[PDB]
Every structure is written in structure tokens, then in C-alpha cells.
Amino acid sequence: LNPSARIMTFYPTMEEFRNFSRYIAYIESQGAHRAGLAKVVPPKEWKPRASYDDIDDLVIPAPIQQLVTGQSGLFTQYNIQKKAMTVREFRKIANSDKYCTPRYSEFEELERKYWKNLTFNPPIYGADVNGTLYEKHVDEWNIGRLRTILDLVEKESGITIEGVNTPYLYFGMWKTSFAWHTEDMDLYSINYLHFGEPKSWYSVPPEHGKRLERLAKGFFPGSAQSCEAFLRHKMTLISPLMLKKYGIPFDKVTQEAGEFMITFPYGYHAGFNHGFNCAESTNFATRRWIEYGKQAVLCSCRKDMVKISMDVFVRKFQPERYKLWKAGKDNTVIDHTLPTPEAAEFL
Amino acid sequence: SETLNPSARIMTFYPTMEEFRNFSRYIAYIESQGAHRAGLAKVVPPKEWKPRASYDDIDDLVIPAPIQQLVTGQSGLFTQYNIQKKAMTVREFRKIANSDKYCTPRYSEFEELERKYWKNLTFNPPIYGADVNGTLYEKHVDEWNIGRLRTILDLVEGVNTPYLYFGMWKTSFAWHTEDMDLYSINYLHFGEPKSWYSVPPEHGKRLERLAKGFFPGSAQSCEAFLRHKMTLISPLMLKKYGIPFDKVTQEAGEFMITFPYGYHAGFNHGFNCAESTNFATRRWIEYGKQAVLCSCRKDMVKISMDVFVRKFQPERYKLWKAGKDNTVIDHTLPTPEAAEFL
Amino acid sequence: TLNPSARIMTFYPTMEEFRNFSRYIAYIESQGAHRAGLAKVVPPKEWKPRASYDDIDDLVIPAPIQQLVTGQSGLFTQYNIQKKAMTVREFRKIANSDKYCTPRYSEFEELERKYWKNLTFNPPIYGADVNGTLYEKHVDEWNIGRLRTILDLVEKESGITIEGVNTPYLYFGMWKTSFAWHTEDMDLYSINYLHFGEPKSWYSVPPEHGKRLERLAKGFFPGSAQSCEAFLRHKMTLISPLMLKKYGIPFDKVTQEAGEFMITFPYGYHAGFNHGFNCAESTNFATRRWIEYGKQAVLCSCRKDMVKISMDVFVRKFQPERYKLWKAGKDNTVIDHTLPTPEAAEFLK
Amino acid sequence: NPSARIMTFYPTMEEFRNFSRYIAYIESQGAHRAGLAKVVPPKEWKPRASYDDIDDLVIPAPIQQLVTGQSGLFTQYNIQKKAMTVREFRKIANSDKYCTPRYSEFEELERKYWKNLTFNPPIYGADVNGTLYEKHVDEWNIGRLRTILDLVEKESGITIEGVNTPYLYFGMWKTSFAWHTEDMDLYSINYLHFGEPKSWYSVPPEHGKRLERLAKGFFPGSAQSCEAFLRHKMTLISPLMLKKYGIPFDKVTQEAGEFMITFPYGYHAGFNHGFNCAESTNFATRRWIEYGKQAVLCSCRKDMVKISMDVFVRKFQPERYKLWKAGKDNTVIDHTLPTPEAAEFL
Amino acid sequence: XVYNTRSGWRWYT
Ligand SMILES: [Cl-]
Ligand SMILES: [Cl-]
Ligand SMILES: [Cl-]
Ligand code: NI
Ligand code: NI
Ligand code: NI
Ligand code: NI
Ligand SMILES: [Zn+2]
Ligand SMILES: [Zn+2]
Ligand SMILES: [Zn+2]
Ligand SMILES: [Zn+2]
């Protein structure tokens, strides 16, 4: 619900595509980050992997059955762990009659069916599977090695956070969904849909993020009192009709196989898989993210939640502020419209 | 035998203190009145009888594995998923159960509360303090002691141990028979009622057929999929397909008895504690021999019937071991122990 | 003059002599067999009560009894511990195992010595008192299911069924399983056929000397005697032959082998043990001579479930003249244990 | 090894009152090392004024004790007999056939016991639910010792007869209890209310394992059938046999009015001198928890006593809980160490 | 995963 808040799609050339961080800076020079979500279609020649035939014996350690409870466009999703299985067993179940995609003509019908049947026939989600489907020799947009400043966490701190600085794989089926959330530490996220059916996304522009959580707080007051950042549990589903009803600007975009999805700092997003598919995702950062990292409201109710020490980042990139920030006197106000400094080359 | 309880309706018994004292003998008696044909029966013990003097010392009782009951479904067909939660005390459980979020809704007539249950089943998933190893009976109580009924089920070489159930509003038990098609005894110590649905054993197959029709995937994955205790079917749905069933509400101080191959289901009206165990009579042995068991899980409850066949059907042991004991169960027939009442 | 020594007699009937069981009992009594209290009858080799014993492994022994024995100096008491039902297969695996199998021995006397030496050690299991028969239906000769003696009148007229008395009992034995000194219930006759397996050894006190054994037993177990008039009927009392010799009780020994019958006669005290795994079938039967024993049999008073047969029907049918005297209580007939059964007249002519 | 010999304690009334504390004290003195200890209560303390009003008390399942064996190795079979009153039981017990034999020194009676074990099976009025303690006695009340064992009833409500409830035992001459540790290798308390003495044999917990091995060697069949066949309480081993195979042991006679404490993993056996009545139950301390975790239980019977250790581990060993539930808890028990509660007495 | 209990299939996440 705002012209600069609309999701942009980008069609780089192979030459534009090579330097990932630089292309992120470019799309931010173009205002992409204001939608909180952006699509990047890689050049037709580019592939991260020659074939997906060898993955059928790949194991999904902890498939998740997504049980959704709720009504009136407000839902809570519970992730029930299932027996490990291969993507062959997963694909069988996904393509079976009980879990296959419904028959539809236009996306809007599939969306209506998603929100109508959300709480029925809980699908299984092969989510959070460690590993990459990139071949190790692919230097362009390798989710396994984006070479972003986020690397400072593993390089300097020695901390490995699975899914954040490591690649995650997601085997989806119809009605498998991801709840409204920003990334851990309000980082950037990258999502590549390797193969299969599309993943539809909803995005709330970061400028309106506080409004969304506000709405969420009003509708899940128990969850809000238990935890300030309860949306970080990734259990909260809110329908587009509720967003529209409460004046939350949002946009929707559908990601097809072979396409990239970029999530920008503090960009709340949600969505669902049309059917059987496989996506790879990880987090990344830019200089712009550092401030977000400093100000990210995190989950207080679980000890295992992702928390990154911002020390190394402030020290390296905001030396003048380090002591000030360590003193708790860094009162910088984030401007969600501003592009990342690396985009000055394009301005 | 078919002349007794022809209706197959749930019967209620009001034994005097001397009729009540011998539990096994009384099970045989209520079977001599045809109670077993409903698959479910109520026994109101004499007011003088109390298993426990008071229930004010159970706040420290620990529920090791409370389960949040997520329900998915519509049109009277649901699947329940029991999610293990963090251990809590009965005091903690009572505080949640009675809280605004989870407490019983306002209602005047039972049918209203039933309507609300079937309407809101999928929302605000409650916590069931179920399957707690324990008893609220005092040691000295020798009548109807669920902890030690001393039926032939003790011969198994724990189905015969006591289990406590701390319910809150719209906590449910799915349609099922007992493991090994055994008997069930359920005593409501205190608190709000527990409503029960039951299908006469005579018509159990019909329910199964209906169930298999509505969950073909589950049935393909497991013949006895109802034994997972995840399948909720509303009474309106049973009535729509002409499946005979009965309902009965159990109140504090009351015993419910489920009989071999009696399908039953139900829900708790609010915070309560029940205590139940399985038991057997000689009639059960054939049921045990013929019970269709859950194929798909290695840790399902499976009792070897061998000791029972030797001890109570020696003449048939060989035949049974050769897979050739094709006795047909007559669900109307009382347990032989009922002879003295016939 | 017939069988003065009162020693156990063995018989080898031909198939034609064999047919009529009751008649053959009359015959062996004509020969004084009853005076030993125990007699062996070897059936003709053509005769078999069952074609094979291959199909009984899954036959259930409802109440196997582990026999604990306490005592010393040839005087023992046997306590039966009931165990859970087991099959003949399981029983045989136990019986033939190294723990319970027959020990190695040269001559019978050695095995008898080992029995009385190890009687109290390593208690064996006895597959005793099993309701059933291993006779095939077609067998009409010496069918322990249907001996058709006068005892049938208990079930026919009086309508009374007594397991092991009216009906057949099977017995699966192993090494040093014992039966204690006793007479039959109601001082009846006994028939014991060893279907298969290892021998069963028997001790027999002549009925003429039964009162002597009793008197000895009462002396050795004074408490038991005070508690019950016929405490030997509990079948717990084991008395070694050396004690019978030491106190001058006449007795005889006989070893019964597979395919052989043992008849015990009214008021014939007997005991014994099994050499190893075997199966025996027994029941009680009667002749007119038994009636006087039944009328006079001293019975267990201490147990409410002990076997008692109403003798009225028998006296009415076979002693019509005496009923009123006997019913009055002045029928002081005195049994002569040497006199054969009346049915033996034709064999004494 | 007096460090591992049975000790007798004579508490004053003030130190008698807190039972659990006094157990901690006798542990501070090393009583637990013997596996068995005697506690003579104050002379003024009495659990019950008179014992003449219990003649009509029913012994539901009196057991006749048939013993088979030789050369100091025996197996005891318990034949249930018809229910009888204390009156009937004592009549038999004091009768001519079952009375105590004539003897001068204790060793003579022990000799007669082991010589006549397999003869004249006595009747043992054992495992009688009930207490002879008068209601208003708050010291060493076997019905309610208030030890941490109570936690299992406090969290589940489950009771196990004779373990967390009292048992009465009416013994006569030659009635014996076989070599065993308590269920779950718990503590045991035994109070001889009245009557003739009870003799005890104790093997120090340090050497308990050796006893097991020895028993396994003598009853290989029984040891193949059950991991812990001694828990059947059927195995009688004469002291001569223990000495021959070098099993350290001690013996003590408990007179009437005397307490015996059995310590975790303390094997003990013995016999009653004549007609008597004892009351016993189990109890625990913090030290017991590890024993309970490592107790080798009977694997061949479903009726065997099993206590869930989760309550105790979670409450008193949170630090090890995750590892213990994981199966990574490799604590090795020092049977010498006293209970942490003994901290007061060094 | 899942384990079987008297009351059904219990899912321990
Ligand atoms: Cl809430
Ligand atoms: Cl299905
Ligand atoms: Cl005697
Ligand atoms: Ni995301
Ligand atoms: Ni049930
Ligand atoms: Ni006989
Ligand atoms: Ni003990
Ligand atoms: Zn949180
Ligand atoms: Zn199944
Ligand atoms: Zn008697
Ligand atoms: Zn065992």
C-alpha cells in the first residue's frame, strides 16, 4: 500500500550478477529494500547445479508437520517433529492425493485455498536441512559462501550459527508456510528456489514493521506478554485480509524455481509453498545491517535463540561509536528508506 | 442373552455397599443385566464409599508429560495431535485450567456445552494432564481399587497399573477401544464432568468402516489406525451415517466401565481428575485373541495371549496356536462369571 | 493257599483273555493277585491304545507341581507347589535337561539308591492330575476312559463326576517324581497304563498288612495323625523301603515299563517314583468285592473337598439284603483281604 | 575389619527423636560400611503399650518355608497356607514340633539352624500389612519415617507395600529370610516388637558384588534366568560357605525392642529364634539415590518392585539429570562414603 | 519424533 513499498524484480546480466554484495548495493540504490522483499531473476545461462537427480536419497533429519490453529485470518502454527525421511519419501507424500496442490487457474485462487484450508490436513515441511545444493565450484551467488561482512561472526568470533551463516535447505509441499517474521538479528536473507512449485511471499515494508508487530501484539496479547519478540518464534500467521483490514501496507510476490528472493533488514515476510519444491537459504549482511543488528529486538523467552555479538561489527565499521555504543549511549535512529553505503557507487 | 438390554443403551448401576464390595463379581453382575452391550456403563458407588478422604493434598502431584491437544479438521471429522509439554504440578495445571484463557464456557444445558465443544475443538488448544502413573486412592481402600483390581489381567507375563488424568475444558479422548480390546475402569475423583460417547460392540465394525472411509490414508498405513487415539468423530457425523451410539456424562464420584471392543470417545467439561486402568474377565480372552492390533509401531501395547489360552482354554491351545481357533465372538453374551446372576 | 507270599504277580493275557477287562480282573484275583495289593498286566504285543504320541507336544499340563521333599532317615513329607500351565513339549525339555534328567546307573538298585539319596534335592516337576486320555476312540479293550466296571454307577445313577476317579488322569513324570504312600480314594481299585517313556517303580504293601503301615506311619507322623484320621490320603508321606524293612512291614517292589498296566487293589498301599520322562494314564475302578471296602474306607476328615462316594446305591444294588442293617449301622462285616471277588467264581470252578 | 563390623548405637531420647538425622549420624560413625547396624532405643521409648490385644490379628498369607539343598547352599520355597490368626500362629510356633530347640550358647542355636534348615518347615507369618505402633508416637514410626523416599508417593501417590508402607512379620523358630538387598537397594528399618530374637548376617556393601558372583557360581541356572535372582529372596548360604570363599560378613542378634538398620546394597540374611513379631519398611537418604540409579533389578518377574528414579534425580541431582537420562552418568559409588546429610558430624 | 502411551501417540518435539 505505497508506490515505493512495492516488491521489485531484477534481471541482472551475468556481469552484473557476479559480485553479489555489489548487486545488493545496486538494488538498494534502486529502492528495492523499501519493500522489504525483492526478487532477483538470475541470467538464463547461470545454474548452481547441473541436475537434481542425485538428491532423492538425501535425508531430511527432522521433517515438521505444520499444525495450524486459528480463525478469522489469525493463526498459530505448531511444528510437530516427524520421523526422518528422504526427499523420495517426502516427494511421494507431497505428490500424493492428500497433500498435492489443489487444482487452480490463477494464483489468487490458490491463495484463497491456502487461507481457507490452512488449518486442515497439516502438511509436512522438510525444513532447516543443513547442506547446500550448490556445486562447490559456483562462485556467483553461492549461498554457501556469499563472502559478506556477516562472515566476521565465524571468522572473528568462531561461532557457527546453522541457517544464519550456513546454508539451509527446505523441501516444501502444498500449504507448507513460513510465519510472519524478520530474520534473526534483523539480517538480510537470501532464498533460492532450486526446483519445483513456487513459493508465494508476503512482505511488509520495514517502515511499517513496527505497525505489524503492534497489530500482532494486539491479537496475541498472551504471547506478547510472555515474549516481546514473540513473532521470532515463527508461529504467527496473519492473512492478507487482516493486514488490509488494519491498514498494514503489504505486497505479495510469487517465487518460481530458479529465482532468488532477497529479504531486507527488518522486512517482515510470510508465505507458503504451492507444492513440492526445494529452496536453499541463508542470512547475510551489509554495512547498513550493522545498525539493525544493534537495535534488533530479540526473543527473551528462549535461551537457545540466535543472538550475534555486534561488537566486532561496530568496532570495525563504527569505531568512532564503539565506546559510545558500549556505554549504551548510541541513540541512532534508523532510516529504513536509506540505501546501504556500498550503494554510493550507484548514486 | 439377546433379551437383556436389547436397546444396547448405556446402563447406570447404583450398587449398595455389599453389592459394590466385590468388583469382579459386580462386573459380572452388570454383564448379567446386559450392560456390556452398550460398550459403556456407569456405576454409582454408595455415597458412604470414598477412595480418598479429601483432594487438598494433590497440588504437589507432578504431571511429567502434559500434552497440548492440537485438533485439525472440519465437518465433524478431526485428527488430534498430542504435543508433549514441559512437566508441571497439579497446582500449576489447575491454575491454567481455571484461567480465563482455558476455563469452561458459560452454559445452561449440557447440549449447549457439547455444541460449544464440537464448535471450538480446533481453537485454543488445551493441555491434558494425561497418562500420569499414579493413584489418588488411599492404601486402605480395598473396593474398586483401580491400582489393584486383581483381575485375571494380572496374569500378563503396565496395562493393569493406575493412571491419573487431569483434564481441563474440551480436553478430548479420541474414538478407540482399549488396548487388546480390554476392559476399562475410569473413576472421576473430583472436578467437572467427563462426557462420553460409545458405540455398542455389536456395531463397532460399522464405526471402523466409517472411520476407514473418512481417513483412507491412515487406514492404508495401519489397519487399526484408530488405536493411535488421534481420530475424533462428532456424534452428528455418526448419526448422519446411522451408526448407533449413546452418550453419557460422568460426574465426580462415578465409575465408567468400558467393555471389550467398546468404541468410546469424549471430552472433559473442565478441570477434573480421573483415574483409570484396564482389566479383564474371562470373556475378554477371546477378544484379546482376536483384537486387531496396530501394525505400524514397534512400541504398541501387545499382550501375549498364550498364558490365557493355556490356563483358560487348554483344550483349544493347540488349535489356537495352529491359527485354526476360529471362534466367533457373540458380543451380547455375558462373561461366564455372570452365571450366578442368570 | 493262593499267593501265600502275597507277591506282585505279572500277567501276560492273550488278546482273547485281554478283551473283557472286568473279567480279567476277576481272573487275576482268582490267582491271588490282589493279595500283593499291586499286580502288573502286560498286554499282548498286538495291542496298542494309540497309534503314535507324536501329536501331543502342545497338550497343556494345567497344574504342574514342583515336588519339594523334606525329611531324613527314610521319612519324608512331599509338598506340591503348583506352577503355571506348561505344554508337554516344555515339560519334556525340562525333564530331559541336564538338571533334571535321569542319572547314569548300572542296575535298578543303583537308581533306587539314588532316588532315596537325592529325594530332597533339586525338586522335580510332575505333570500330574491332567484331565484327559491318550486312548484313541476305537479302542474297546482296557480303555481307561470306559472300563465299564460297577463304579460307573456313581456317574450313571448318582450323577456324580470325580476327576481322576470316574474320569481318566494323565501324568507326565520326570526323574525322581514321586507318588506318596496311599490307597486309592474310597479304597478303590486303580488302573495305571504307562503309555511311553521311562519306567515307573512301585512299592506295594499287601492289603492284609495295610493297617501295619498305617500304624507305623501314625507313629512317625504323630501330629499329622492327630490332625486327620487318614492323613496318608493327603499323599504327602514318603517312607523308604528300608524303613518298612526296619519295622517289619511286608512289601514288594515292581518296575512298570512302557506299554504295561499296573492294577492296585482295594486297600493296597503303594508308592513309587518315575525313572525319567514318561506319560501314564490312570483311573479308579471297582468290583463287587470293593463295595465292602467302600463302606468301610476310613476317610480324610480334615478337608471339606476330599473324595467321598455315597455307598448307598451300591449296597442297594449288590447287597440288597444288608442295606437296612448297614443303614442301621450294625453291619459289622469283616473284610478278608485274601478272598477273591465274587466274579472270580467261574475261574475257581 | 572393625571398620566394616556391625555397630550398635544407644541414642539418648533427644537424639533419637529425629530419625533421619540419627541415620545421618550413625553413617558419620561408619555404620553403613557393615551394611547392617543396631539401634537400641531409649528405655523410656515404647512404640506400643501392650501386645496382648493382637491375638485376633489375621495373617492373611502365612508361608510354610520348604528348604532344599546341602553343603551350606539352599533354596527356600514359600508355600502359602490358609490364613490364620496370631493366636493360631503362636500356638503352632510355641508347640512341641515347632518350638525353639534347647541351647545354651547362641552358636549352638546357629549350628542347629543350619543343621535342621531343610527339616520341619516352619510357618512364617510374613508380609502382613499393618503397624503395631500406637497412633501418637512421633519417633521412629515405621508407618511415617518422613524420609525422602516419601517423594515418590508425594509426586505420584503410588505406594508399594512393605517399601513405603509398614509390614509385620510373625516369626517362629527357624523361619529365615534369604540373602538379599532391599528392593531398589534401599535402606531398611526393622523393629523387633516382642518375642524371641532375630539373628542377622550382613555382608559389607564393599564386598556385596563378591557375594553376587559367589551366588552366581552356585546357582548358574538361576543366574541365567534372572540378572538379580537373589532378589527372589530364595537363596540361603551358610556362614561357613561365605568364610570358605572369603566373603567378609558379620553376624548380630537383634533382641526384642531393638532396631536394625539395613544400608543400601547391604546383603543380609538370617533367622528367627522363636515366636516373635517384627515390623519393617524401607526408607532412603540422599546417598541412596545413586544406588537407586545403579540398582540391578529382577528382570524375570513383572511383580518385582521398581521405583522411578526421575523424581529423585531431577530434585537432588539436576546437574547430572541430562546425562543420566542420556545414559552418560558414569558415577562410581564409594560404599565407604557417608550420606551428605552427615556433614554435621564430620 | 513420537512414542506410544496409554492415551495415544504422544509427540515429543
Ligand atoms: Cl495470546
Ligand atoms: Cl487419511
Ligand atoms: Cl508329625
Ligand atoms: Ni525468512
Ligand atoms: Ni479408554
Ligand atoms: Ni495310586
Ligand atoms: Ni531385608
Ligand atoms: Zn520468545
Ligand atoms: Zn498403527
Ligand atoms: Zn485329612
Ligand atoms: Zn528375577
Numbering used by the authors:
A (entry chain D): 8 to 354
B (entry chain C): 5 to 161, 170 to 354
C (entry chain A): 7 to 355
D (entry chain B): 9 to 354
E (entry chain E): 1 to 13
Article excerpt on this structure:
Histone lysine methylation is dynamically regulated by methyltransferases and demethylases (KDMs). Two families of human KDMs catalyse the removal of methyl groups from methylated lysines on histone tails in a sequence- and methylation-state-dependent manner; the flavin-dependent lysine-specific demethylases (KDM1/LSD)6 and the JmjC-domain containing KDMs (JmjC-KDMs), which are Fe(II) and 2-oxoglutarate (2OG)-dependent oxygenases (KDM2–7)78. Although the catalytic domains (JmjC-domain) and active sites are highly conserved, all KDM4s remove the repressive H3K9me3 mark, but only KDM4A-C are additionally capable of demethylating the activating H3K36me3 mark. In conclusion, we have used in vitro selection from a ribosomally synthesized library of cyclic peptides to identify natural product-like inhibitors of KDM4A-C, which act via a previously unidentified binding mode and which have unprecedented selectivity and potency.
To investigate the structural basis of the unprecedented selectivity of the cyclic peptides, we crystallized CP2 with KDM4A (2.7 Å resolution). Interestingly, the structure reveals that CP2 occupies the histone-binding groove of KDM4A, but not the 2OG-binding pocket, the latter of which has been exploited for most reported 2OG oxygenase, including JmjC KDM, inhibitors. Moreover, CP2 exhibits a binding mode, which partially overlaps, but which is clearly distinct from those observed for H3K9me(n) and H3K36me(n) histone substrates. Analysis of the inhibitor conformation revealed that CP2 adopts a distorted β-sheet fold with two turns; a type 1 β-turn (Thr5-Gly8) is closest of the two β-turns to the active site metal. Strikingly, the structure reveals Arg6-CP2 bound in the sub-pocket usually occupied by the extended trimethyl-lysine side chain of the H3K9 and K36 substrate residues. In addition to mimicking the positive charge of the lysine, the guanidino group of Arg6-CP2 is positioned to make hydrogen bonds with KDM4A residues (Tyr177, Ser288 and Asn290). Two KDM4A residues in the CP2-complexed structure (Tyr175 and Arg309) move, relative to uncomplexed KDM4A, to open pockets that accommodate CP2, suggesting flexibility in these regions. The Arg309 side chain rotates by approximately 90° relative to the H3K9me3/H3K36me3 bound KDM4A structures to accommodate Trp9-CP2. Tyr175 also shifts by approximately 90° to accommodate Arg6-CP2. Analysis of the polar contacts in the KDM4A-CP2 structure provides a structural basis for the selectivity of the cyclic peptides for KDM4A-C over D/E.
